[PDB]
Amino acid sequence: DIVMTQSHKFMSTSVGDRVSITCKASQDVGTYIAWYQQKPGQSPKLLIYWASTRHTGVPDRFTGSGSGTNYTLTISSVQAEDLALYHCQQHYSTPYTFGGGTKLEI
Amino acid sequence: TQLPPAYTNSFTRGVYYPDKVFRSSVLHSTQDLFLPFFSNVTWFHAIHVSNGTKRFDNPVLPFNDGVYFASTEKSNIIRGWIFGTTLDSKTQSLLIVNNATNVVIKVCEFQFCNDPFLGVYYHKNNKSWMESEFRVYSSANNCTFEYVSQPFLMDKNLREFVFKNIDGYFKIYSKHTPINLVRDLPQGFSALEPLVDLPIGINITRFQTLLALHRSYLTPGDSSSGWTAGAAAYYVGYLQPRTFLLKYNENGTITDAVD
Amino acid sequence: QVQLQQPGAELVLPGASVKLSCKASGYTFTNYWMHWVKQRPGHGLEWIGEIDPFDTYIKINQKFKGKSTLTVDTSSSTAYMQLSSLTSEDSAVYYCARPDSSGYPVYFDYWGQGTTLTVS
Amino acid sequence: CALDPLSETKCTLKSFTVEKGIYQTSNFRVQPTESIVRFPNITNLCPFGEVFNATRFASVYAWNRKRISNCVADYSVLYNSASFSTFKCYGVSPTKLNDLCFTNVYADSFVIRGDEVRQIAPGQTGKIADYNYKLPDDFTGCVIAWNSNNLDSKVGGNYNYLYRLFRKSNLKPFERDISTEIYQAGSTPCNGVEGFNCYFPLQSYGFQPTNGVGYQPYRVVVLSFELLHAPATVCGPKKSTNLVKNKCVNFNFNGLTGTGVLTESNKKFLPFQQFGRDIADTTDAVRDPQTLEILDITPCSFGGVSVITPGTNTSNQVAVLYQDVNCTEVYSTGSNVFQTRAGCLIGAEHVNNSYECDIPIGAGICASYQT
Ligand SMILES: *[C@@H]1O[C@H](CO)[C@@H](O)[C@H](O)[C@H]1NC(C)=O
Ligand SMILES: *[C@@H]1O[C@H](CO)[C@@H](O)[C@H](O)[C@H]1NC(C)=O
Ligand SMILES: *[C@@H]1O[C@H](CO)[C@@H](O)[C@H](O)[C@H]1NC(C)=O
Ligand SMILES: *[C@@H]1O[C@H](CO)[C@@H](O)[C@H](O)[C@H]1NC(C)=O
Ligand SMILES: *[C@@H]1O[C@H](CO)[C@@H](O)[C@H](O)[C@H]1NC(C)=O
Ligand SMILES: *[C@@H]1O[C@H](CO)[C@@H](O)[C@H](O)[C@H]1NC(C)=O
Ligand SMILES: *[C@@H]1O[C@H](CO)[C@@H](O)[C@H](O)[C@H]1NC(C)=O
Ligand SMILES: *[C@@H]1O[C@H](CO)[C@@H](O)[C@H](O)[C@H]1NC(C)=O
Ligand SMILES: *[C@@H]1O[C@H](CO)[C@@H](O)[C@H](O)[C@H]1NC(C)=O
Ligand SMILES: *[C@@H]1O[C@H](CO)[C@@H](O)[C@H](O)[C@H]1NC(C)=O
Secondary structure (H helix, E strand, C coil), X not given: CCCEECCCCCECCCCCCCEEEEEEECCCCCCCEEEEEECCCXXXXXXXXXXXXXXXXXXXXXXXXXXXXXXXXXECCCCHHHCXXXXXXXXXXXXXXXXXXXXXXC | CCCCCEEEECCCCCCXXXXXXXXXXXXXXXXXXXXXXXCEEEEEECCCCCCCECCCCCCEEECCCCEEXXXXXXXXCEEEEEXXXXXXXXXXXXXXXXXXXXXXXXXXXXXXXXXXXXXXXXECCCCEEEEEEEEEECCCCCCCXXXXXXXXXXXXXXXEEEEEEECCEEEEEEEEEECCCCCCCCCCCCCEEEEEEECCCCCCCEEEEEEEEEHHHHCCCCECCCCCCCCCEEEEEECEEEEEEEEECCCCCEEECCC | CXXXXXXXXXXXXXXXXXXXXXXXXXXXXXXXXXXXXXXECCCEEEXXXXXXXXXCCEEECHHHCCCCEEEEECHHHEEEEEEEXXXXXXXXXXXXXXXXXXXXXXXXXXXXXXXXXXXX | CCCCHHHHHHHHHCCCCCCCEEEEEEEEECCCCEEEEECCCCCCECCHHHHHCCCCCCCHHHCCCCCECCCECCHHHHHCCCCCCECCEECCCHHHHHHCCECEEECCXXXXXXXXXXXXXXXXXXXXXXXXXXXXXXXXXXXXXXECCCCCCCCCCECCCEEECCCCCCCCCCCCCCCCCCEECCCCCCCCCCCCCEECCEEECCECCCCCHHHCCEEEEEEEEECCCCCCCECCCCCCCCCCCCCEEEEEECCCCEEEEEEECCCCCCCCCXXXXXXXXXXXXXXXXXXXXXXXXXXXXXXEEEEEECCXXXXXXXEEEEECCCCCCCCCCCCCCEECCCEEEECCCCCCCCCCCXXXXXXXXXXXXXX
């Protein structure tokens, strides 16, 4: 089915810098995507269930923007707690597929 | 011009199956609204055309508990009945209308016409009678029930009907039997099998018989020369609380009764 | 406060079967479908399959057909998941994901604790 | 008492020695193996195939009303479809919706974009939300949305559907604006100029294959469920199991709610008659609700259990008589079982020669202690 694979190997920015989190898509299936923040040693946490609106308990630094061909997530400000795995999963058909994930390091 | 009525002997007719239970070769005693034996039955003359002046006498009778209805018609002149209490659009009323296609029973706030009936014309090319117009009600509102079923009235013979309204339910029973009597109801026993049951849930205390009128009857003149509707007659009895000893044969058909 | 409790830390010898359970608390057990996911550091996360509660509608992902099996018990809000003939490469972490909506597709809004499977 | 038949006999007589003879101690009875329920061939499923499966849907500027009632609807069936995407249910969940009953189950149909799917939430605001359709804050029911880019999508461009871009007044839940009065763009009065002063409220959809998720035409419905202080006409359907004969089962034949052994019968009903009775005024036969057969009903076999023993001084062996019971339905079985008109005799062996009667069993059979 649709396969999720981010482009950038890892996220490498200092505190407060603006960085982008890519998530490529096999084909055009709309903005049917999600984002998970899976800390090393912790279960994934929801960040972006939809690009337009953000779910409960999320910082306002994270931005939602769906390109349509691939999914990119930009963070305005980065703190210590922002270092985790960024898993992206599409929800368009019955088979679901996750992204490769990226671990943020300074 | 009102046509005077008459009287006739019911002679044990009008017995129906009180319920759905099957019973074989047993005598079961039940207390149900029944037509009393030998209780005399009103004999109405719906239309009497002789001069040829048209006589429109289809009076609206009161629905006192149940009603036993019978008629001896071979032209399918009778097409339905009216049921209700106020017979206007203020309250819903039960209607029955039948033509060549099927039987339609509508329970709406029908605003009744002065003298409802059914109009039919003769198709000269196809050599058959098919409907022209329906002249029953001014308008219908708050339609809740729309029942359709195969024509049971269509197609010398006697047709017996019973109407009962209990527990917000309407019940119709029927039986078809060839007979050789005209003025008086034939003697003999034949149980009335239930035809349909409906959850209408409206009060009914007043009824009238419907008719099918040929196109010649609707002429402006007071005399009709293309339609011979002299056979328009029917019998009406009234049901009462009675105890009956119904006899069931081995097949389960009611073959005798005792009042 | 939704309690998604997973004991974890289960090890089964090769060629045998495994059974795992996931208790659900803090919400209504009736109004949510079940979706199973698998965690692997080798190539990221992946989806095991879905099962609807109090029924037997089976829909598993094309990657994990045959070996994977799902069963649902209404009592105690537990989910029953079984593999057969465990291999060495099946050393990973298993999860039970509560979905956002009752109908497919879902994005697995809330994730419980991780159950680690390892050949012993 | 419950150790063995001899001890049950001792308990019944309240004596430690029982004299030769037959004593009634227990009472055999057969319990139903399973519950059987059947309902006839009638479904009257609500017209969901017409509302969902169609050629052209009503546009959003006049959101249509369906008024579905007096029928049973299996909502989990569509919940188990293969096309639907969005199933965000408000209030009553579909699994409990199948169990629960509502008087009327309204359905809607309008054409909205992917970004405006969230606007169908109760109290949500937006362009379509605040102009075309708005859901009340206290809504109970489900709204279903899914992607359909092959039925209602055009390569050149789908301009059939259109929305209310502008609206002077404030929309209320369950309200529509079918009139096409011209909008007043500015403070100047509007007199049908269609220019700066007057704008056209109904702006056309632009649907293209390359358009994003927020521009794609989706087929959405609002399953409005409301309570009107009326008898409930919409409820979940009920299943009928398979049929079993010559076995003790619990049957619910459209309300017969009895228990017994169903078997084939040669008796024939009248076409309108449903079930039968007898002199005792008990349910005797029931016709199959699904097909046209007659199933005679016989009650569960039961009868007294009589322990046939000689005196305890003579021996401690016993024989148990199951009165009015067939040995197919029956000391534990398998020890010289025997059938007679009295019932099943267990523990005693039939002998061809005839002696004088010792312990009267019934119907000419007499039991005795012998080599
Ligand atoms: C009943 O009707 C018959 C008609 O045959 C009539 O002779 C008789 O007088 C009637 N009885 C009463 C009490 O009206
Ligand atoms: C009369 O017949 C026509 C067609 O012949 C049918 O459409 C209509 O429903 C009938 N009217 C009734 C049954 O009242
Ligand atoms: C229409 O009929 C229903 C029941 O059939 C009744 O509840 C309702 O009040 C009626 N509407 C009127 C009389 O305006
Ligand atoms: C008849 O009218 C009474 C009110 O006078 C009402 O309670 C009852 O339900 C009605 N019966 C039917 C069958 O409509
Ligand atoms: C009863 O059923 C038998 C069975 O065919 C039939 O021949 C008979 O005419 C029926 N009626 C009576 C009165 O026996
Ligand atoms: C019903 O839906 C199926 C699924 O898309 C479709 O193939 C079929 O043509 C539809 N039937 C209609 C629209 O009559
Ligand atoms: C009732 O439905 C079943 C289901 O297929 C069918 O086989 C049976 O023939 C139906 N009943 C009758 C009387 O046809
Ligand atoms: C047991 O007692 C009975 C009398 O109660 C007697 O007839 C019988 O012979 C006794 N049996 C033996 C084996 O002594
Ligand atoms: C007991 O059941 C069997 C079933 O094989 C039957 O053949 C036999 O006639 C039954 N006995 C009686 C007394 O009905
Ligand atoms: C008893 O008699 C029956 C028939 O009368 C016979 O079949 C059976 O073999 C006999 N058994 C003995 C032990 O005599």
